[PDB]
Design an enzyme around this catalytic site. Structure first.
Site, PDB file in Angstrom:
ATOM      1  N   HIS A  59      17.589 -56.265 -55.018  1.00  0.00           N
ATOM      2  CA  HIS A  59      18.270 -54.596 -54.721  1.00  0.00           C
ATOM      3  C   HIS A  59      18.501 -53.596 -56.405  1.00  0.00           C
ATOM      4  O   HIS A  59      17.840 -52.631 -56.812  1.00  0.00           O
ATOM      5  CB  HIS A  59      18.815 -54.074 -54.318  1.00  0.00           C
ATOM      6  N   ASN A  90      22.784 -44.907 -45.599  1.00  0.00           N
ATOM      7  CA  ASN A  90      21.768 -44.450 -44.311  1.00  0.00           C
ATOM      8  C   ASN A  90      21.961 -44.955 -43.451  1.00  0.00           C
ATOM      9  O   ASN A  90      21.244 -45.578 -42.530  1.00  0.00           O
ATOM     10  CB  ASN A  90      21.143 -46.230 -45.402  1.00  0.00           C
ATOM     11  N   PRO A 146      32.741 -34.453 -54.761  1.00  0.00           N
ATOM     12  CA  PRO A 146      32.054 -32.854 -54.801  1.00  0.00           C
ATOM     13  C   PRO A 146      31.072 -33.030 -56.350  1.00  0.00           C
ATOM     14  O   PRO A 146      30.284 -32.644 -56.265  1.00  0.00           O
ATOM     15  CB  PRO A 146      32.506 -32.190 -54.640  1.00  0.00           C
ATOM     16  N   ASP A 167      23.347 -32.575 -52.874  1.00  0.00           N
ATOM     17  CA  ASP A 167      23.080 -32.152 -53.739  1.00  0.00           C
ATOM     18  C   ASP A 167      21.287 -32.475 -53.990  1.00  0.00           C
ATOM     19  O   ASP A 167      20.967 -30.814 -53.736  1.00  0.00           O
ATOM     20  CB  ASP A 167      23.564 -32.481 -55.397  1.00  0.00           C
ATOM     21  N   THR A 192       4.076 -30.060 -56.622  1.00  0.00           N
ATOM     22  CA  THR A 192       4.323 -28.930 -55.762  1.00  0.00           C
ATOM     23  C   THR A 192       3.942 -29.248 -54.176  1.00  0.00           C
ATOM     24  O   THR A 192       4.860 -28.371 -52.945  1.00  0.00           O
ATOM     25  CB  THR A 192       4.198 -27.615 -56.101  1.00  0.00           C
ATOM     26  N   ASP A 230      25.004 -52.748 -59.848  1.00  0.00           N
ATOM     27  CA  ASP A 230      24.636 -53.300 -58.769  1.00  0.00           C
ATOM     28  C   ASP A 230      24.514 -54.580 -59.269  1.00  0.00           C
ATOM     29  O   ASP A 230      25.298 -54.425 -59.036  1.00  0.00           O
ATOM     30  CB  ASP A 230      23.265 -52.469 -58.427  1.00  0.00           C
ATOM     31  N   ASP A 232      11.053 -26.729 -48.410  1.00  0.00           N
ATOM     32  CA  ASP A 232       9.622 -28.115 -47.722  1.00  0.00           C
ATOM     33  C   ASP A 232       9.807 -29.287 -47.313  1.00  0.00           C
ATOM     34  O   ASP A 232       9.097 -29.720 -46.735  1.00  0.00           O
ATOM     35  CB  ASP A 232       8.903 -28.367 -49.192  1.00  0.00           C
ATOM     36  N   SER A 287      19.157 -45.540 -51.486  1.00  0.00           N
ATOM     37  CA  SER A 287      19.570 -46.042 -53.015  1.00  0.00           C
ATOM     38  C   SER A 287      18.569 -46.059 -53.201  1.00  0.00           C
ATOM     39  O   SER A 287      18.309 -46.246 -54.480  1.00  0.00           O
ATOM     40  CB  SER A 287      19.542 -48.089 -51.942  1.00  0.00           C
TER      41      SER A 287
HETATM   42 CA   LIG Z   1      27.680 -32.433 -56.039  1.00  0.00          CA
END
Ligand SMILES: [Ca+2]
Length: 279
Positions: free
Chosen positions: A69, A161, A175, A200, A16, A39, A260, A224
């Site tokens: 990567h 990025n 979406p 999200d 937390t 990837d 936060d 990434s």
């Molecule tokens: Ca979404």
């Protein structure tokens, strides 16, 4: 379970509060789930993967990760030391060449591959896909990510990025998938992270230690790197029975640490992925 002196991002997704260094998690650790890492490939023979990683598809002359990567991302999903879901099965799909780039047609084919290939794998607890890639908006790329999610795979995608609104990037802007922004160890939005109403969730994305090619390790930064934290978290939660592939993004957002983060532009969620583990 408790892993001391864990990478800061693992410690963060079970806390937390910022500023701790132990990762706490249920010992089931994603067993019985599967995560596809779409990837540059995965160096499966790396001991950190303990035989749980395998290349299943490439669109190039080799399935070897010649970049690193994809190996780094897979390590954050599921390596023994650096991973969220330390017992998941990892499946590599090489849609990006060893310079880290790929044509949209190849990326689309790899997404459709996963939607079918999951029927060839044993993933009784559920299937996740981690997409640490992206480029400019393409309705075709978004559609492919939407199909993958509709097929019953939890799709986690990097926001990008560009320090810009993720609406202009794909598959970030689709979406129905889980679009992931990046944060740093002091709970700031990472300077480079895209933002916007399509995001999200945030995950750790600055200075992330994970596996690399040649049996090595290194720290790198990006959305990434945030994406595989969320993909691994989904696998972990699906093994615990808390959610399913269709619901996991909403579950993660509902159970996230809320309000936060700093440098969150108005209109962007202030949610940070959290496993809610209580030992
Ligand atoms: Ca979404």
């Amino acid at each position: 379970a408790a892993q001391t002196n864990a990478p800061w991002g693992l410690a963060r997704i079970s806390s937390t509060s910022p500023g701790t260094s132990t990762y706490y998690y249920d010992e089931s650790a994603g067993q019985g789930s599967c995560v596809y890492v779409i990837d540059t490939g995965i160096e499966a023979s790396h001991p950190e993967f303990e035989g749980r990683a395998q290349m299943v598809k490439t669109y190039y002359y080799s399935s070897r990760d010649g970049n690193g990567h994809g190996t780094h991302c897979a390590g954050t999903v599921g390596s023994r030391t650096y991973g969220v879901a330390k017992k998941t099965q990892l499946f590599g799909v090489k849609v990006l060449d060893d310079n880290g780039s790929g044509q949209y047609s190849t990326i689309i084919a790899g997404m459709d591959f996963v939607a079918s290939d999951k029927n060839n794998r044993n993933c009784p607890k559920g299937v996740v896909a981690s997409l640490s890639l992206g480029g400019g908006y393409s309705s075709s790329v978004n559609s492919a990510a939407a199909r993958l999610q509709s097929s019953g795979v939890m799709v986690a995608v990097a926001a990008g990025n560009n320090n810009a609104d993720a609406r202009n990037y794909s598959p970030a802007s689709e979406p129905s998938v889980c679009t992931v922004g990046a944060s740093d160890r002091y709970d700031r939005r990472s300077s480079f992270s895209n933002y916007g109403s399509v995001l999200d969730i945030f995950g750790p994305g600055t200075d992330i230690l994970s596996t690399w090619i040649g049996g090595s390790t290194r720290s790198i930064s990006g959305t990434s790197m945030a994406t595989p934290h969320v993909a691994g978290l989904a696998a972990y939660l699906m093994t615990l029975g808390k959610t399913t592939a269709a619901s996991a993004c909403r579950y993660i957002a509902d159970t996230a640490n809320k309000g936060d983060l700093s440098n969150i532009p108005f209109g962007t969620v202030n949610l940070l992925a959290y496993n809610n583990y209580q030992a």
